[PDB]
Paper text:
The first step of the pathway, aldol condensation of phosphoenolpyruvate (PEP) and D-erythrose-4-phosphate (E4P) to 3-deoxy-D-arabino-heptulosonate-7-phosphate ([name]) is catalyzed by the [name] synthase enzyme. In [name], regulation of [name] synthase is thought to be controlled by its N-terminal domain (BsCM_2), which has residual chorismate mutase activity. A functional trimer has three active sites formed at the interface of two monomers. However, BsCM_2 forms an entirely helical dimeric structure with two active site clefts which are formed by the residue contributions from both monomers, as previously described.
BsCM_2-CIT and BsCM_2-CGA structures contain four and two monomers per asymmetric unit, respectively. In BsCM_2–CGA, the monomeric structure contains a ‘Chorismate Mutase, type II fold’, a three-helix bundle connected through the loops. Chlorogenic acid, a structural analogue of the enzyme’s substrate, was co-crystallized with the BsCM_2 protein. Unambiguous electron density of this ligand was observed at both the active sites of the dimer. At active site S1, the chlorogenic acid makes hydrogen bonds with the side chain of Arg27, Lys38, Gln86, and the main chain atoms of Arg45, Asp47, and Phe79 of chain B. The ligand molecule also interacts with Lys38, Arg50, and Lys80 of chain B, and Arg10 of chain A through water bridge formation. In BsCM_2-CGA, chlorogenic acid interacts with active site loop L1 residues Arg45 and Asp47 directly and via water bridges mediated by hydrogen bonds. This extensive hydrogen-bonding network might be stabilizing loop L1.
Numbering used by the authors: 4 to 39, 41 to 88
């Protein structure tokens, strides 16, 4: 059915998104290794810079606040990975 074809396409997109989140995680781990800091590595200026750039590029069907929510979770995960 058409609905099953669309769900398959979304399923494959999920795995494409996962692969990029993982590649991004490896980059953020390397950033941790490079950056020699205080109690924690949180940098709100960096966060805001990334967020602004993502929103600048948001032509898609989601609201900017929704996109921000999702990327904040991605970032939070990156920081936690570094702090491992
Ligand atoms: O932006 C953040 C943290 C964002 C965050 C959002 C919600 C939270 O509840 C939280 O604990 C951290 O950190 C910068 C980006 C980074 O998380 C990334 O590129 O994945 C690396 C981190 O070292 C930066 O400070």
């Amino acid at each position: 059915t058409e609905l099953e074809l669309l769900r398959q396409k979304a399923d494959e997109l999920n795995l494409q998104i996962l692969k990029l989140i993982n590649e991004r995680g490896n980059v953020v781990k390397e950033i941790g290794k490079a950056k020699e800091q205080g109690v924690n590595r949180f940098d709100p200026v960096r966060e805001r810079t990334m967020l602004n750039n993502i929103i600048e590029n948001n032509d898609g069907p989601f609201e900017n606040s929704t996109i921000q929510h999702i990327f904040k979770e991605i970032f939070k995960a990156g920081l936690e990975l570094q702090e491992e």
